[PDB]
């Protein structure tokens, strides 16, 4: 557990890898985005660029697919999503290495999660804030990546949550190009799987049951070729719910939800859950100060492994 | 019980603290070391007793030691810990609130008296020591009950009555604002933003305010029933809510004496006033129960510790645990950990289990290392890789090498028959006519009886690589012995029935244990005539039961009770070597039963050695699907599948595996290995006729001819338009037509084989996709080493970068 200091003056909120795994982008409450690179010679995380992005605390950033370039989206509490393209003819650690592309001002609420779509669906994007509205933005103009048009606008929640109540919203796409377009959308305590119907509009496809309290993180397991899709869920309870999704009106194919396993090992709130490249290791972080790794041994049932305390 | 953190008194790293016992009798001065989590870090300095009943407490920041203590009887006592004067109002009444400013100015909040002010502000330097009553410089709030007050700066005071919330400046005789609210208790300024303060009410409704909103009026936040009740009825209340002095936009609350909720707030400006909302609440269980009040201890690296006073007056120190906020993985099995407290980020690289060993033994890094080493591009190379560094993978790649050699040499290509990568089950079970299938099977053996199905056994021996001669048997014995594997050679000799040859091979070995095993095996040749049931047979059975080497276990289990069913059912030995004795030393009546049981085992279990039986048929794809479900080894599944999956049939599962492995190769930046995989897919899709079945990458160049304005793609040394014959557009540097090799000159653009390859690579077709101007590759490399503009006249396009 070698630590490296990122250099933020406040709480680091979202850290995300890129596709190649040699770049990390960290956003924090100091209204800054820092991109770090891993040199093959020094083998240490060195800062590439740090620049001020928003007027509030940035809470969600995501990398785009590398076939569309170097694009970083960024969601903050100032109700904006800003897109950042990198021009390589600029100096590192200067603040001008990443150029702004667009501001998505359509959100009437502080945004919580932004996830890019898989590359086979285009240069799409997803938004979710404290107004219950799921917004999809597409880059339909190929000449310039500054005109991102809103395509879909759903309503996950009937009314926005109150000012004094905490809320959490998480997003997860389905990284399979051999299945219809899906989007795992988490409300306060509701988890919804969407589908793109034949009419070109998103429809409610399945609902993951349970979830007695707030959902902190949703992670779709990568489609390695298996016939079942796996969704991991971290709740405000101590529950790490893993759903087994099998796929076979105005939807391309119906799909069923089976709760594969449910674990109470954290005795707290599972703040984040994440998958591996192959979807064989499940990393969960809770309030016990422990990061637990999970694997499936001898069957489909997931069992615990190495526990990392911090 | 009151705990009051004190700043600007200690020049060292220690933080001063002031405490009041729950019986409100004494003032204890503490000194807590922030970097030591032990209970002995709370150092008791001095205790000032002889107080009646303390209702409020305040300290002076400028002068060290000066502590004001109010009381319910009416006497404010100003004294020192690190003089002693009792002062009171003209009319004696309870001091609800007290504030001492930095410039020595002292305010006072009293109860309701109709003939006296409840906010009396005075300086101690102009106080006559001969009288107990104070002479106030500024008096405010007559006929009111000031229950909380706070000094915002050197001149203004933010006072709270029982029905109003005021901000009074001493340079004016009029309050700045008077907002009517019932939440007017325990004003706490935010240390990171003076405009934000925070009161609560009698029902427990906490409210965070903004002074700019009240000046101009709603509270900025409100929490119904968050803190304790009875503010108006009870005068002796424990402050169960503290602002965060470690970071902004955070506060902590005490609930039921057991948990502490750190509410982290978020802000947005509707455009300077920030509208707040609750983002995350973090709950921390207290070390001991029955906690009445608490306060913050700042540590280094944005740490947090909470000094807590229990209901019995015991003061203890409790840390705040480092809770991980995000544990993201990688394509290299690298874990990245982010905390909820500090800034630094922890990383667990790959270089209850250990984390490093569990990430090192996952298949996402095993597949990465194998793809780095070149796994699957040539089956003999895979076998040599595995043998130089999970034994079923070597067996299935050995079978794949044998079958690929059989296909490539035309042993299965010739005839009106495919028979390509077909397993033992498909040959043995039959399936246009029965005589037609018999004669096409016969012509394979007639290229290089004693049984009803004899030619099928010959084809199954050809597929399984078990049609070697006696000289080839001796050559295989020598090859196996040359690797130091004497036990494998003895097992191979016993498998073909040459038990004396196994005795000879294991004789004169390099191990004493092997020589003892050789003597044991040699004690059979004269014993084969016996009926048996000896103690020696029992010794051999026990030795076969206890041995760890599977080949010697095979020998000792076969020598005693010499039947073949005790060898060809265990999973310790390879299925190819099991079929080497099932197709050779067994009869067709039970061979179909054995093949059916083994096929039904390997289809649902998902063993890669079942490809002996199923081949690369659709049943082989089902076996590979079970293997992917069991192990998530999509790399081996894809490399096995591409030998026959587009060539002989078409299914979506193999396309999914190929796309997944290509995406993983892209994610590991192994682009050269991905290209080698693509050319291997294109090479292995050639049918017997020769038609490609692979979905190759489509064309990206459709050059428009300049003379006829038509597509040239609707000549190994010179490319021209097929419609008219006109040459390609000229190079921008040398004005020669592009697309032609062997130019009259040498393009020496910016180990003789690599030099010649570079020279013949310099004369290619290179062009910019922004200005559409063509160049030779060497000409473009030599031009842009000195310039930065397109060489064509009239074009301003920096094609380099
Ligand atoms: Zn032409
Ligand atoms: Zn040229
Ligand atoms: Zn040009
Ligand atoms: Zn150009």
PDB file of C-alpha atoms in Angstrom, chain A residues 1-17 19-22 24 29 31 38 43-45 55-57 67 77-79 89 110 112 115 130 163-167 177-178 216 223-228 236 269 271-272 274-278 280-281 283 285-287 289 291 293 295 304-308 310, chain B residues 220-223 247 263-264 266-268 270 276-283 321-349 352-356 358-359 361-364 367 625 628-629 632 634 652 655-657 659-660 663-664 666-669 671 801:
ATOM      1  CA  UNK A   1       0.000   0.000   0.000  1.00  0.00           C
ATOM      2  CA  UNK A   2       2.336   2.734  -1.220  1.00  0.00           C
ATOM      3  CA  UNK A   3       0.635   6.148  -0.883  1.00  0.00           C
ATOM      4  CA  UNK A   4       1.015   9.137  -3.170  1.00  0.00           C
ATOM      5  CA  UNK A   5      -0.251  12.602  -2.253  1.00  0.00           C
ATOM      6  CA  UNK A   6      -2.515  13.975  -4.971  1.00  0.00           C
ATOM      7  CA  UNK A   7      -2.173  17.582  -3.793  1.00  0.00           C
ATOM      8  CA  UNK A   8      -5.810  18.602  -3.345  1.00  0.00           C
ATOM      9  CA  UNK A   9      -6.629  21.140  -0.645  1.00  0.00           C
ATOM     10  CA  UNK A  10      -9.885  19.350   0.242  1.00  0.00           C
ATOM     11  CA  UNK A  11     -11.652  15.984   0.075  1.00  0.00           C
ATOM     12  CA  UNK A  12     -10.929  13.873  -3.010  1.00  0.00           C
ATOM     13  CA  UNK A  13     -14.365  12.743  -4.182  1.00  0.00           C
ATOM     14  CA  UNK A  14     -14.072  10.667  -7.377  1.00  0.00           C
ATOM     15  CA  UNK A  15     -10.999   8.857  -8.706  1.00  0.00           C
ATOM     16  CA  UNK A  16     -11.360   7.093 -12.069  1.00  0.00           C
ATOM     17  CA  UNK A  17      -8.960   5.166 -14.287  1.00  0.00           C
ATOM     18  CA  UNK A  19      -9.182   2.664 -20.577  1.00  0.00           C
ATOM     19  CA  UNK A  20      -5.457   1.858 -20.605  1.00  0.00           C
ATOM     20  CA  UNK A  21      -5.036   2.087 -16.828  1.00  0.00           C
ATOM     21  CA  UNK A  22      -1.977   4.363 -16.969  1.00  0.00           C
ATOM     22  CA  UNK A  24      -5.997   8.547 -13.254  1.00  0.00           C
ATOM     23  CA  UNK A  29     -14.011  19.757  -3.256  1.00  0.00           C
ATOM     24  CA  UNK A  31     -12.912  22.724  -7.456  1.00  0.00           C
ATOM     25  CA  UNK A  38       2.343   6.500 -14.556  1.00  0.00           C
ATOM     26  CA  UNK A  43       7.103   3.638 -11.806  1.00  0.00           C
ATOM     27  CA  UNK A  44       5.544   6.406  -9.704  1.00  0.00           C
ATOM     28  CA  UNK A  45       2.400   8.493 -10.120  1.00  0.00           C
ATOM     29  CA  UNK A  55     -17.552  26.706  -9.053  1.00  0.00           C
ATOM     30  CA  UNK A  56     -18.565  23.964  -6.593  1.00  0.00           C
ATOM     31  CA  UNK A  57     -17.301  20.593  -5.398  1.00  0.00           C
ATOM     32  CA  UNK A  67     -11.137   5.909 -29.946  1.00  0.00           C
ATOM     33  CA  UNK A  77     -22.780  20.534  -7.420  1.00  0.00           C
ATOM     34  CA  UNK A  78     -23.097  23.759  -9.464  1.00  0.00           C
ATOM     35  CA  UNK A  79     -25.567  21.983 -11.824  1.00  0.00           C
ATOM     36  CA  UNK A  89       0.843  20.884 -27.656  1.00  0.00           C
ATOM     37  CA  UNK A 110     -26.774  19.393  -8.372  1.00  0.00           C
ATOM     38  CA  UNK A 112     -24.119  13.364  -8.683  1.00  0.00           C
ATOM     39  CA  UNK A 115     -20.770   7.966 -16.947  1.00  0.00           C
ATOM     40  CA  UNK A 130     -30.895  15.745  -7.109  1.00  0.00           C
ATOM     41  CA  UNK A 163     -32.849  20.246   0.959  1.00  0.00           C
ATOM     42  CA  UNK A 164     -31.900  18.696   4.315  1.00  0.00           C
ATOM     43  CA  UNK A 165     -32.091  14.990   3.419  1.00  0.00           C
ATOM     44  CA  UNK A 166     -29.035  13.264   2.021  1.00  0.00           C
ATOM     45  CA  UNK A 167     -29.309  11.588  -1.366  1.00  0.00           C
ATOM     46  CA  UNK A 177     -22.031  -4.711 -27.730  1.00  0.00           C
ATOM     47  CA  UNK A 178     -24.027  -7.934 -28.235  1.00  0.00           C
ATOM     48  CA  UNK A 216     -24.142   4.339  -2.731  1.00  0.00           C
ATOM     49  CA  UNK A 223     -19.311  -8.821 -20.201  1.00  0.00           C
ATOM     50  CA  UNK A 224     -16.532 -11.381 -20.631  1.00  0.00           C
ATOM     51  CA  UNK A 225     -18.682 -13.761 -22.689  1.00  0.00           C
ATOM     52  CA  UNK A 226     -20.784 -15.414 -20.004  1.00  0.00           C
ATOM     53  CA  UNK A 227     -24.521 -15.822 -20.524  1.00  0.00           C
ATOM     54  CA  UNK A 228     -25.473 -13.899 -17.355  1.00  0.00           C
ATOM     55  CA  UNK A 236     -26.412   2.395   3.067  1.00  0.00           C
ATOM     56  CA  UNK A 269     -22.358   1.410   4.747  1.00  0.00           C
ATOM     57  CA  UNK A 271     -19.645   3.256   0.045  1.00  0.00           C
ATOM     58  CA  UNK A 272     -18.191   1.931  -3.218  1.00  0.00           C
ATOM     59  CA  UNK A 274     -16.168  -1.992  -8.236  1.00  0.00           C
ATOM     60  CA  UNK A 275     -15.284  -4.836 -10.583  1.00  0.00           C
ATOM     61  CA  UNK A 276     -12.136  -6.103 -12.257  1.00  0.00           C
ATOM     62  CA  UNK A 277     -11.476  -6.201 -16.001  1.00  0.00           C
ATOM     63  CA  UNK A 278     -12.876  -9.745 -16.189  1.00  0.00           C
ATOM     64  CA  UNK A 280     -13.866 -11.878 -11.182  1.00  0.00           C
ATOM     65  CA  UNK A 281     -12.825  -9.628  -8.262  1.00  0.00           C
ATOM     66  CA  UNK A 283     -13.832  -4.647  -4.328  1.00  0.00           C
ATOM     67  CA  UNK A 285     -15.328  -0.386   0.860  1.00  0.00           C
ATOM     68  CA  UNK A 286     -17.263   0.086   4.092  1.00  0.00           C
ATOM     69  CA  UNK A 287     -17.336   2.026   7.373  1.00  0.00           C
ATOM     70  CA  UNK A 289     -12.166   0.780   7.603  1.00  0.00           C
ATOM     71  CA  UNK A 291     -11.687  -2.939   1.773  1.00  0.00           C
ATOM     72  CA  UNK A 293     -12.137  -8.424  -2.190  1.00  0.00           C
ATOM     73  CA  UNK A 295     -14.388 -13.955  -5.690  1.00  0.00           C
ATOM     74  CA  UNK A 304     -14.884 -13.274   0.557  1.00  0.00           C
ATOM     75  CA  UNK A 305     -11.100 -13.056   0.218  1.00  0.00           C
ATOM     76  CA  UNK A 306      -8.249 -10.741   1.311  1.00  0.00           C
ATOM     77  CA  UNK A 307      -9.436  -7.925   3.587  1.00  0.00           C
ATOM     78  CA  UNK A 308      -7.445  -4.680   3.399  1.00  0.00           C
ATOM     79  CA  UNK A 310      -6.890   1.383   6.204  1.00  0.00           C
TER      80      UNK A 310
ATOM     81  CA  UNK B 220     -30.124  28.233   4.809  1.00  0.00           C
ATOM     82  CA  UNK B 221     -30.775  24.741   6.200  1.00  0.00           C
ATOM     83  CA  UNK B 222     -33.142  23.312   8.791  1.00  0.00           C
ATOM     84  CA  UNK B 223     -33.083  19.934  10.551  1.00  0.00           C
ATOM     85  CA  UNK B 247     -12.395  21.510   6.908  1.00  0.00           C
ATOM     86  CA  UNK B 263     -22.795  15.952   8.023  1.00  0.00           C
ATOM     87  CA  UNK B 264     -20.883  17.011   4.910  1.00  0.00           C
ATOM     88  CA  UNK B 266     -22.583  20.824  -0.600  1.00  0.00           C
ATOM     89  CA  UNK B 267     -23.072  24.294  -2.057  1.00  0.00           C
ATOM     90  CA  UNK B 268     -24.115  26.009  -5.276  1.00  0.00           C
ATOM     91  CA  UNK B 270     -27.508  30.570  -8.265  1.00  0.00           C
ATOM     92  CA  UNK B 276     -26.456  24.557   1.060  1.00  0.00           C
ATOM     93  CA  UNK B 277     -27.667  20.965   0.904  1.00  0.00           C
ATOM     94  CA  UNK B 278     -26.672  17.745   2.648  1.00  0.00           C
ATOM     95  CA  UNK B 279     -24.351  15.603   0.515  1.00  0.00           C
ATOM     96  CA  UNK B 280     -23.163  12.804   2.819  1.00  0.00           C
ATOM     97  CA  UNK B 281     -23.573  11.852   6.483  1.00  0.00           C
ATOM     98  CA  UNK B 282     -20.867   9.751   8.147  1.00  0.00           C
ATOM     99  CA  UNK B 283     -21.717   7.930  11.381  1.00  0.00           C
ATOM    100  CA  UNK B 321     -11.318   6.035  11.502  1.00  0.00           C
ATOM    101  CA  UNK B 322     -10.024   6.364   7.934  1.00  0.00           C
ATOM    102  CA  UNK B 323     -12.956   5.067   5.877  1.00  0.00           C
ATOM    103  CA  UNK B 324     -12.174   4.271   2.241  1.00  0.00           C
ATOM    104  CA  UNK B 325     -14.438   6.148  -0.176  1.00  0.00           C
ATOM    105  CA  UNK B 326     -13.561   4.383  -3.444  1.00  0.00           C
ATOM    106  CA  UNK B 327     -11.718   1.144  -4.236  1.00  0.00           C
ATOM    107  CA  UNK B 328     -11.352   1.136  -8.027  1.00  0.00           C
ATOM    108  CA  UNK B 329      -9.627  -1.738  -9.791  1.00  0.00           C
ATOM    109  CA  UNK B 330      -7.696  -1.731 -13.069  1.00  0.00           C
ATOM    110  CA  UNK B 331      -6.998  -3.801 -16.159  1.00  0.00           C
ATOM    111  CA  UNK B 332      -3.630  -4.629 -14.534  1.00  0.00           C
ATOM    112  CA  UNK B 333      -5.298  -5.753 -11.253  1.00  0.00           C
ATOM    113  CA  UNK B 334      -4.200  -2.554  -9.502  1.00  0.00           C
ATOM    114  CA  UNK B 335      -6.288  -1.280  -6.587  1.00  0.00           C
ATOM    115  CA  UNK B 336      -6.612   2.448  -5.862  1.00  0.00           C
ATOM    116  CA  UNK B 337      -7.976   3.557  -2.487  1.00  0.00           C
ATOM    117  CA  UNK B 338      -9.368   6.996  -1.631  1.00  0.00           C
ATOM    118  CA  UNK B 339     -10.168   8.103   1.907  1.00  0.00           C
ATOM    119  CA  UNK B 340     -12.965  10.232   3.330  1.00  0.00           C
ATOM    120  CA  UNK B 341     -10.574  12.180   5.593  1.00  0.00           C
ATOM    121  CA  UNK B 342      -7.225  13.083   4.011  1.00  0.00           C
ATOM    122  CA  UNK B 343      -5.942  13.831   0.503  1.00  0.00           C
ATOM    123  CA  UNK B 344      -3.428  11.041  -0.195  1.00  0.00           C
ATOM    124  CA  UNK B 345      -4.348   8.060  -2.372  1.00  0.00           C
ATOM    125  CA  UNK B 346      -3.250   4.488  -1.643  1.00  0.00           C
ATOM    126  CA  UNK B 347      -2.238   2.062  -4.396  1.00  0.00           C
ATOM    127  CA  UNK B 348      -1.885  -1.734  -4.288  1.00  0.00           C
ATOM    128  CA  UNK B 349       0.048  -2.709  -7.413  1.00  0.00           C
ATOM    129  CA  UNK B 352      -7.801 -14.657   4.228  1.00  0.00           C
ATOM    130  CA  UNK B 353      -5.358 -14.140   1.368  1.00  0.00           C
ATOM    131  CA  UNK B 354      -2.863 -11.370   0.920  1.00  0.00           C
ATOM    132  CA  UNK B 355      -4.138  -8.599  -1.389  1.00  0.00           C
ATOM    133  CA  UNK B 356      -1.036  -8.623  -3.601  1.00  0.00           C
ATOM    134  CA  UNK B 358      -4.831 -12.484  -4.683  1.00  0.00           C
ATOM    135  CA  UNK B 359      -4.411  -9.829  -7.376  1.00  0.00           C
ATOM    136  CA  UNK B 361      -3.229 -15.007  -8.925  1.00  0.00           C
ATOM    137  CA  UNK B 362      -6.297 -13.615 -10.687  1.00  0.00           C
ATOM    138  CA  UNK B 363      -6.842 -14.512 -14.326  1.00  0.00           C
ATOM    139  CA  UNK B 364      -6.874 -10.874 -15.512  1.00  0.00           C
ATOM    140  CA  UNK B 367      -4.016 -13.597 -19.341  1.00  0.00           C
ATOM    141  CA  UNK B 625     -18.761 -21.705 -22.924  1.00  0.00           C
ATOM    142  CA  UNK B 628     -15.674 -19.451 -19.657  1.00  0.00           C
ATOM    143  CA  UNK B 629     -18.486 -19.724 -17.095  1.00  0.00           C
ATOM    144  CA  UNK B 632     -13.465 -16.580 -17.187  1.00  0.00           C
ATOM    145  CA  UNK B 634     -11.867 -15.902 -22.620  1.00  0.00           C
ATOM    146  CA  UNK B 652     -22.430 -15.414 -31.698  1.00  0.00           C
ATOM    147  CA  UNK B 655     -17.756 -13.412 -31.874  1.00  0.00           C
ATOM    148  CA  UNK B 656     -18.340 -12.188 -28.312  1.00  0.00           C
ATOM    149  CA  UNK B 657     -15.161 -13.924 -27.116  1.00  0.00           C
ATOM    150  CA  UNK B 659     -14.378  -8.973 -29.444  1.00  0.00           C
ATOM    151  CA  UNK B 660     -13.811  -9.234 -25.681  1.00  0.00           C
ATOM    152  CA  UNK B 663     -10.845  -5.100 -26.321  1.00  0.00           C
ATOM    153  CA  UNK B 664      -8.708  -6.489 -23.489  1.00  0.00           C
ATOM    154  CA  UNK B 666      -6.389  -2.856 -26.594  1.00  0.00           C
ATOM    155  CA  UNK B 667      -6.745  -2.048 -22.883  1.00  0.00           C
ATOM    156  CA  UNK B 668      -3.321  -3.558 -22.092  1.00  0.00           C
ATOM    157  CA  UNK B 669      -1.794  -1.581 -25.024  1.00  0.00           C
ATOM    158  CA  UNK B 671      -1.712  -3.570 -30.214  1.00  0.00           C
ATOM    159  CA  UNK B 801       1.144  18.453 -34.886  1.00  0.00           C
TER     160      UNK B 801
END
